């Protein structure tokens, strides 16, 4: 423990695995399984957070005694951040949000605070920074979502050269905003979809197989200043894969179209909660964008992680939706 | 007796001070080193050597069965004081 | 690319090693002043089957047993791996 | 008298001896020994085929009435063959006494269930193979009672390690409790108090 | 003369497989057979008297929030005794463990005298007493 | 630089003078990411592609019995003799003697303290060798 | 003599295979029930795998005695599966999906740790 620090033990939770990481947004979906990763090697994990410590419980669990250690701080604060970094050896930025806030719009939680986050990261000394991006990500598209992660993650690659972007399509698991999604328009009436699902392509990839690789990139050496990919095994169509989620939960699928702009005005009006929306405009727009197909980035296969198929590990998920299942037809490679 | 290291954390008396490049110091961040501000062997040096007018004098840590188990110091040597074993109260001999 | 070195291995007072410990006082004297720069290693231990290993060159090994050998085959045995390298 | 000294019972040892001699006639086929402690407690040591016969004598017959059985338990030395040694501590409310009696088995051969003779031996055989991994033949439900579903091991075993090899969890990414090799952030020290010095020398063993 | 029907079994005894133990720490072990060394420190031979059988010492590190000694080896604290070295191995081989036998090592029997330290001519005089 | 562990932290074998062999025992782990020093060389090996034979302890002195029998009979002194052979190798080549006194390294004990690596960093050593050149107080 | 010992069950080893593969037939068709009752992720197949390496671990014994107990422990872990005296963190014991693989080469273990 004097140069970085030294590994010692069986990589069990009293182990210690020397990695000291700040995890940005470990209080969200893929950040406790990051946090539980981390933990559950031996790893001084510190979770800063914005919400109540109330909420923050369900990551106590996750490490030895004095292992996750919590602080304050503000996406607008320069020096809550460099509190949260100053000590670390790797930094991981998970901030993200689905919809605006009045407060924080696409442009804070994906460009400035993101930037932010690499430039005191810098200068504090940190060596490796570890940022999660989206596959679909570039500016051109009607999802502000996209665009701003495209700025963003042109801004971190900038601030941060040594720097890892992580592209990960659609996540799916047990708390995720995927499959889920796909289960809750049965209170309203069949299964709005622009066009019929046709024409939209999508490869989801598993919860564990993004965390496994988030692991491998801290300890890879030659990930520096690299760009992956990750991706699920297979590819498949909105509509089939709509299909299946509604076949595995048992629940009567009735798909009908609707437009393109009629898709928009429903968004606008369930956007307009002070919760949580369920969904939004640009909601609409990303789960209907075609995953992009970027064969010059490695994904999965480069840090040694298998991608778990959709079939196998989704009955998990939508197990508590319920009140021999034919895979989803899929795309073939060619 | 508290020192401050350069970093600007406090030295305990075992002379435990992290270094500028330890990521142990993370866990004082928003909470505080406590540090026992009454350094022993600080408060012990305070007290003055006392004169006696024997080669053996004895202490038991003063209040009788309160104290520590009684001692007999030899006080022939006179380039140094007796110092007790338990309580490090020192002795010296009158002019021998 | 051949001999590198010797290695006899044989007991003290074992029947089995008799022949062995004929050739070291006789033969082994005139073995090494034939080899100067050859190291023969004779390593004797209780109770241990006598044997010779051979190291060529690039660290192959081949060792023959000699058991129950007489002080004339232990010599014959030399010349085949003295003679015939490998 | 003497009064930091236990008094000794002549009385009573007396008596114990001669009901052991009295045991050891009337079956000469299993008993192997017979000893009173200095604290007057008469030890039945047999061999295991005579768990029946001898357990049935002592709870039955005129002069016995050992109709209680106090506890049954099991003591692991390693160094022995028959590393288990099974104890029986049986009571006589008629004659107001106590006998124990000690047999003995490994870690395959099996012993005679003694159900038939007090059923209060159920529970016990079942705490003696869950923690020392001694099979009672014969035994109605013979199954764990003690240790977690499932465990891996006999604890009470000298051999086994006090923490033993795996520890519980929860795993947020599984949700639920999962088993994991142990691991201590303070290891147990082990201290060695033995003193180098003999302390009764009238238990000195030949050299 | 026993009435219970025996069985005959020709193998060497063997229990690996219903001890629980896991193989991790079956094959990757070294057991030590051992007679205790006496304590330099004092002239007592009472711990010398019996056999031991220890395990092969493996890593300890210092864990990060007290700086407390950490292990994960279950078998750290592990010591049998044993009467004899033969009922020591036996319990070793029945186990699977690898063993090392230690011979004991007994003090050699001593010439004293104490008449030589006066001696007239010998050099066991003594010059202080 | 290759990091290696010290004597007592490795069960390693170790000839006396006398030919017997002994072998030492893991007390603490070495430090670091030091390890044991034959696995620093098998580990080596297979980087090299000439992977050497032995996987484990046991099998390196599974090697050792092969070239030396008697360097796996532990505290065992094995008889070696053939004093005349050596002695009539030893007057074939002749050499002379050199006309200077022979003086061993270590007259004083000045000179016993610090000889090796582990002892030269002793901090007991050193104040061992002060004590027997500047005396006492 | 030394030999004679008490059997357990089985006076050789082709009784005791006989107990072997009816303990076998009894634990491979519970892996259907147990996948249902206790509502596992897993597939009947690979359920079914996990029996066979259960056995298989264990293939080269040949005393009798031992091979009787590794059927009165496997029945009795058939037992506390059938009886629902289990629940789904005991069932899932088997398959170490919590643990990272620990590499059995020489040169992984090597950069890991001081261990065997
Ligand atoms: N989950 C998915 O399907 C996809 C994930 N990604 C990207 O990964 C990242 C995280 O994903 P995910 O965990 O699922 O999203 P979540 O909504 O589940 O979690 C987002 C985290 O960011 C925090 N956050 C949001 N806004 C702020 C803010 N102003 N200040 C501080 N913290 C803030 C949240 O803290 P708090 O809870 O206290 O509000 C929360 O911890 C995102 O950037 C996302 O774009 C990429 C591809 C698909
Ligand atoms: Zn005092």
């Given at each position: 423990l004097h140069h970085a620090v030294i590994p010692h033990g069986k990589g069990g939770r009293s182990s210690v695995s020397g990695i000291v990481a700040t995890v940005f947004g470990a209080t969200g979906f893929l950040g406790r399984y990051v946090v539980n990763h981390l933990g559950r090697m031996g790893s001084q994990v510190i979770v800063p957070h914005r919400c109540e410590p109330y909420d923050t419980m369900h990551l106590r669990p996750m490490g030895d005694l004095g292992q996750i250690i919590f602080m304050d701080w503000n996406g607008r604060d320069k020096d809550s951040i460099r509190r949260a970094v100053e000590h670390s050896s790797v930094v991981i930025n998970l901030v993200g949000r689905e919809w605006e806030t009045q407060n924080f719009d696409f442009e804070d939680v994906f460009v400035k605070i993101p930037q932010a986050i690499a430039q005191v990261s810098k200068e504090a000394g940190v060596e490796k920074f570890i940022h999660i991006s989206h596959l679909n990500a570039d500016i051109k598209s009607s999802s502000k979502y996209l665009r701003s992660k495209a700025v963003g993650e042109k801004e971190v690659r900038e601030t941060f050269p040594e720097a890892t972007i992580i592209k990960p399509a659609e996540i799916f698991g047990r708390e995720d905003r995927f499959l889920n999604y796909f289960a809750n328009i049965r209170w309203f009436?069949?299964?709005?979809?622009?066009?019929?699902?046709?024409?939209?392509?999508?490869?989801?990839?598993?919860?564990?197989?993004?965390?496994?690789?988030?692991?491998?990139?801290?300890?890879?050496?030659?990930?520096?200043?690299?760009?992956?990919?990750?991706?699920?095994?297979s590819r498949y169509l909105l509509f089939d894969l709509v299909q299946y989620v509604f076949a595995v939960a048992h629940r009567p699928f009735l798909p009908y179209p609707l437009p393109h702009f009629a898709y928009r005005w429903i968004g606008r009006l369930f956007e307009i909660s002070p919760f949580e929306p369920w969904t939004t405009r640009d909601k609409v727009e990303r789960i209907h964008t075609t995953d992009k197909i970027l064969p010059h980035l490695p994904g999965l296969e480069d840090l040694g992680v298998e991608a778990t198929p959709l079939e196998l590990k989704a009955i998990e998920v939508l197990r508590r939706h319920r009140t021999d299942v034919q895979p989803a037809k899929t795309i073939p490679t060619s | 007796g508290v020192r401050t290291s350069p970093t600007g954390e406090k030295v305990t008396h075992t002379g435990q001070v992290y270094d500028d490049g330890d990521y142990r110091k993370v866990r004082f961040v928003g909470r505080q080193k406590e540090v026992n501000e009454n350094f022993a062997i600080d408060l012990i040096a305070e007290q003055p050597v006392s004169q006696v007018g024997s080669r053996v004098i004895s202490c038991d840590?003063?209040?009788?069965?309160?104290?520590?188990?009684?001692?007999?110091?030899?006080?022939?040597?006179?380039?140094?004081?007796?110092?007790?074993?338990?309580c490090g109260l020192q002795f010296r001999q009158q002019h021998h | 690319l051949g001999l590198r070195e010797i290695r006899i291995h044989l007991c003290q007072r074992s029947p089995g090693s008799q022949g062995v410990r004929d050739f070291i006082e006789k033969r082994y004297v005139e073995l090494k002043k034939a080899n100067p720069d050859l190291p023969i290693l004779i390593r004797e231990c209780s109770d241990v089957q006598p044997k010779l290993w051979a190291r060529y060159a690039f660290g192959q090994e081949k060792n023959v047993s000699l058991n129950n050998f007489s002080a004339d085959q232990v010599t014959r045995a030399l010349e085949n791996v003295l003679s015939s390298k490998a | 008298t003497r009064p930091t000294v236990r008094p000794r019972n002549d009385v009573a040892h007396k008596q114990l001896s001669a009901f052991g001699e009295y045991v050891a006639e009337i079956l000469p086929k299993y008993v192997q020994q017979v000893?009173?402690?200095?604290?007057?407690?008469?030890?039945?040591?047999?061999?295991?085929?005579?768990?029946?016969?001898?357990?049935?004598?002592?709870?039955?017959?005129?002069?016995?009435?050992?109709?209680?059985?106090?506890?049954?338990?099991?003591?692991?030395?390693?160094?022995?063959?028959?590393?288990?040694?099974?104890?029986?501590?049986?009571?006589?409310?008629?004659f107001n006494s106590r006998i124990r009696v000690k047999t003995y088995t490994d870690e395959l051969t099996p012993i005679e269930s003694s159900v038939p003779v007090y059923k209060a031996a159920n529970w016990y055989e079942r705490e003696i193979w869950d923690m020392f991994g001694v099979f009672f033949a014969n035994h109605p439900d013979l199954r764990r009672i003690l240790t977690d579903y499932g465990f891996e091991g006999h604890p009470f075993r000298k051999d086994f390690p006090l923490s033993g090899y795996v520890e519980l969890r929860y795993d947020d990414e599984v949700k639920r409790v999962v088993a994991e090799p142990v691991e201590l952030a303070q290891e147990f020290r082990k201290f060695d108090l033995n003193s180098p010095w003999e302390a009764f020398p009238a238990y000195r063993q030949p050299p | 003369?026993?009435?219970?029907?025996?069985?005959?079994?020709?193998?060497?005894?063997?229990?690996?497989?219903?001890?629980?133990?896991?193989?991790?720490?079956?094959?990757?072990?070294?057991?030590?057979?051992?007679?205790?060394?006496?304590?330099?420190?004092?002239?007592?031979?009472?711990?010398?008297?019996?056999?031991?059988?220890?395990?092969?010492?493996?890593?300890?590190?210092?864990?990060?929030?007290?700086?407390?000694?950490?292990?994960?080896?279950?078998?750290?604290?592990?010591?049998?005794?044993?009467?004899?070295?033969?009922?020591?191995?036996?319990?070793?081989?029945?186990?699977?463990?690898?063993?090392?036998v230690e011979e004991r090592k007994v003090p050699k029997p001593k010439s004293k005298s104490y008449g030589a330290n006066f001696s007239w001519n010998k050099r066991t005089r003594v010059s202080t007493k | 630089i290759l990091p290696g562990a010290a004597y007592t932290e490795k069960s390693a074998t170790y000839v006396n003078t006398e030919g017997r062999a002994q072998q030492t025992k893991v007390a603490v782990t070495p430090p670091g990411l030091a390890r044991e020093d034959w696995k620093i060389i098998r580990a080596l090996s297979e980087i090299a592609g000439m992977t050497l034979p032995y996987d484990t302890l046991?099998?390196?002195?599974?090697?050792?019995?092969?070239?030396?029998?008697?360097?796996?009979?532990?505290?065992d002194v094995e008889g070696a003799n053939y004093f005349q052979q050596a002695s009539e190798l030893s007057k074939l080549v002749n050499q002379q003697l050199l006309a200077d006194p022979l003086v061993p390294p270590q007259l004083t004990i000045k000179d016993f303290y610090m000889t090796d690596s582990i002892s030269r960093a002793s901090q007991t050593m050193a104040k061992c060798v002060k004590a027997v050149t500047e005396g006492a107080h | 003599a030394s030999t004679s010992v008490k059997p357990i069950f089985s006076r050789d080893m082709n009784e005791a295979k006989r107990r072997v593969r009816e303990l076998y037939r009894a634990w491979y068709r519970e892996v259907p029930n147990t996948v249902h009752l206790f509502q596992l992720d897993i597939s009947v197949k690979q359920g079914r795998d996990k029996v066979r390496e259960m056995f298989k671990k264990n293939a080269h014994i040949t005393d009798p005695r031992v091979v009787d107990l590794l059927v009165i422990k496997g029945k009795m872990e058939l037992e506390e599966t059938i009886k629902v005296w289990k629940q789904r963190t005991h069932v899932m014991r088997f398959f170490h999906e919590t643990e990272a693989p620990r590499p059995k080469d020489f040169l992984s273990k090597f950069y890991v740790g001081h261990d065997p």
């Amino acid at each position: 423990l004097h140069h970085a620090v030294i590994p010692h033990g069986k990589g069990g939770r009293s182990s210690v695995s020397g990695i000291v990481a700040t995890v940005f947004g470990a209080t969200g979906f893929l950040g406790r399984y990051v946090v539980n990763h981390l933990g559950r090697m031996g790893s001084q994990v510190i979770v800063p957070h914005r919400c109540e410590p109330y909420d923050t419980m369900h990551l106590r669990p996750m490490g030895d005694l004095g292992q996750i250690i919590f602080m304050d701080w503000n996406g607008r604060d320069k020096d809550s951040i460099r509190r949260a970094v100053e000590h670390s050896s790797v930094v991981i930025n998970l901030v993200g949000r689905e919809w605006e806030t009045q407060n924080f719009d696409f442009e804070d939680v994906f460009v400035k605070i993101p930037q932010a986050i690499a430039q005191v990261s810098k200068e504090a000394g940190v060596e490796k920074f570890i940022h999660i991006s989206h596959l679909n990500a570039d500016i051109k598209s009607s999802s502000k979502y996209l665009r701003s992660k495209a700025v963003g993650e042109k801004e971190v690659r900038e601030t941060f050269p040594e720097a890892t972007i992580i592209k990960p399509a659609e996540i799916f698991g047990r708390e995720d905003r995927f499959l889920n999604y796909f289960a809750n328009i049965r209170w309203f009436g069949g299964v709005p979809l622009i066009s019929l699902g046709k024409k939209t392509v999508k490869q989801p990839v598993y919860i564990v197989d993004v965390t496994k690789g988030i692991i491998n990139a801290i300890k890879d050496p030659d990930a520096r200043g690299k760009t992956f990919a990750f991706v699920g095994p297979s590819r498949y169509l909105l509509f089939d894969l709509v299909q299946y989620v509604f076949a595995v939960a048992h629940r009567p699928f009735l798909p009908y179209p609707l437009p393109h702009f009629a898709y928009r005005w429903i968004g606008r009006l369930f956007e307009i909660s002070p919760f949580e929306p369920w969904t939004t405009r640009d909601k609409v727009e990303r789960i209907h964008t075609t995953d992009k197909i970027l064969p010059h980035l490695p994904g999965l296969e480069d840090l040694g992680v298998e991608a778990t198929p959709l079939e196998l590990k989704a009955i998990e998920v939508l197990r508590r939706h319920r009140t021999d299942v034919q895979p989803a037809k899929t795309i073939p490679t060619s | 007796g508290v020192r401050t290291s350069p970093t600007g954390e406090k030295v305990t008396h075992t002379g435990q001070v992290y270094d500028d490049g330890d990521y142990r110091k993370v866990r004082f961040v928003g909470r505080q080193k406590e540090v026992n501000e009454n350094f022993a062997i600080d408060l012990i040096a305070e007290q003055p050597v006392s004169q006696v007018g024997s080669r053996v004098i004895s202490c038991d840590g003063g209040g009788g069965a309160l104290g520590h188990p009684r001692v007999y110091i030899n006080l022939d040597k006179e380039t140094k004081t007796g110092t007790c074993g338990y309580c490090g109260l020192q002795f010296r001999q009158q002019h021998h | 690319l051949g001999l590198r070195e010797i290695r006899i291995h044989l007991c003290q007072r074992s029947p089995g090693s008799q022949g062995v410990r004929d050739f070291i006082e006789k033969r082994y004297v005139e073995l090494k002043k034939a080899n100067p720069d050859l190291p023969i290693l004779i390593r004797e231990c209780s109770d241990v089957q006598p044997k010779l290993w051979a190291r060529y060159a690039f660290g192959q090994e081949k060792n023959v047993s000699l058991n129950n050998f007489s002080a004339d085959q232990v010599t014959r045995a030399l010349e085949n791996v003295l003679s015939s390298k490998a | 008298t003497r009064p930091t000294v236990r008094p000794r019972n002549d009385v009573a040892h007396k008596q114990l001896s001669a009901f052991g001699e009295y045991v050891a006639e009337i079956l000469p086929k299993y008993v192997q020994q017979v000893q009173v402690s200095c604290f007057n407690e008469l030890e039945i040591c047999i061999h295991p085929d005579g768990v029946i016969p001898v357990l049935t004598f002592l709870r039955d017959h005129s002069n016995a009435q050992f109709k209680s059985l106090a506890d049954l338990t099991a003591v692991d030395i390693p160094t022995r063959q028959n590393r288990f040694e099974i104890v029986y501590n049986l009571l006589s409310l008629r004659f107001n006494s106590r006998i124990r009696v000690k047999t003995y088995t490994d870690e395959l051969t099996p012993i005679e269930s003694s159900v038939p003779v007090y059923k209060a031996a159920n529970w016990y055989e079942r705490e003696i193979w869950d923690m020392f991994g001694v099979f009672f033949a014969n035994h109605p439900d013979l199954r764990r009672i003690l240790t977690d579903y499932g465990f891996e091991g006999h604890p009470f075993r000298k051999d086994f390690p006090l923490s033993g090899y795996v520890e519980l969890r929860y795993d947020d990414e599984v949700k639920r409790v999962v088993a994991e090799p142990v691991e201590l952030a303070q290891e147990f020290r082990k201290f060695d108090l033995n003193s180098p010095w003999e302390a009764f020398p009238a238990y000195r063993q030949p050299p | 003369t026993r009435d219970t029907q025996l069985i005959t079994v020709d193998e060497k005894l063997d229990i690996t497989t219903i001890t629980g133990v896991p193989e991790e720490h079956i094959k990757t072990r070294k057991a030590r057979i051992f007679v205790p060394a006496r304590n330099n420190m004092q002239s007592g031979v009472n711990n010398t008297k019996k056999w031991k059988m220890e395990f092969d010492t493996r890593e300890r590190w210092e864990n990060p929030l007290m700086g407390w000694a950490s292990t994960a080896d279950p078998l750290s604290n592990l010591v049998l005794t044993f009467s004899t070295k033969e009922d020591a191995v036996a319990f070793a081989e029945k186990n699977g463990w690898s063993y090392d036998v230690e011979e004991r090592k007994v003090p050699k029997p001593k010439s004293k005298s104490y008449g030589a330290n006066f001696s007239w001519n010998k050099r066991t005089r003594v010059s202080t007493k | 630089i290759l990091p290696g562990a010290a004597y007592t932290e490795k069960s390693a074998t170790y000839v006396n003078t006398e030919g017997r062999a002994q072998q030492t025992k893991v007390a603490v782990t070495p430090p670091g990411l030091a390890r044991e020093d034959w696995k620093i060389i098998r580990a080596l090996s297979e980087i090299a592609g000439m992977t050497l034979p032995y996987d484990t302890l046991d099998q390196v002195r599974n090697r050792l019995e092969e070239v030396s029998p008697n360097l796996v009979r532990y505290d065992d002194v094995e008889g070696a003799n053939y004093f005349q052979q050596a002695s009539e190798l030893s007057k074939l080549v002749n050499q002379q003697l050199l006309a200077d006194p022979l003086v061993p390294p270590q007259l004083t004990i000045k000179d016993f303290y610090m000889t090796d690596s582990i002892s030269r960093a002793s901090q007991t050593m050193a104040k061992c060798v002060k004590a027997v050149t500047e005396g006492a107080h | 003599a030394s030999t004679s010992v008490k059997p357990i069950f089985s006076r050789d080893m082709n009784e005791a295979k006989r107990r072997v593969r009816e303990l076998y037939r009894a634990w491979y068709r519970e892996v259907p029930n147990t996948v249902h009752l206790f509502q596992l992720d897993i597939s009947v197949k690979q359920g079914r795998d996990k029996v066979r390496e259960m056995f298989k671990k264990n293939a080269h014994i040949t005393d009798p005695r031992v091979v009787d107990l590794l059927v009165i422990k496997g029945k009795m872990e058939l037992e506390e599966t059938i009886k629902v005296w289990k629940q789904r963190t005991h069932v899932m014991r088997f398959f170490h999906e919590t643990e990272a693989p620990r590499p059995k080469d020489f040169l992984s273990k090597f950069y890991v740790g001081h261990d065997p």
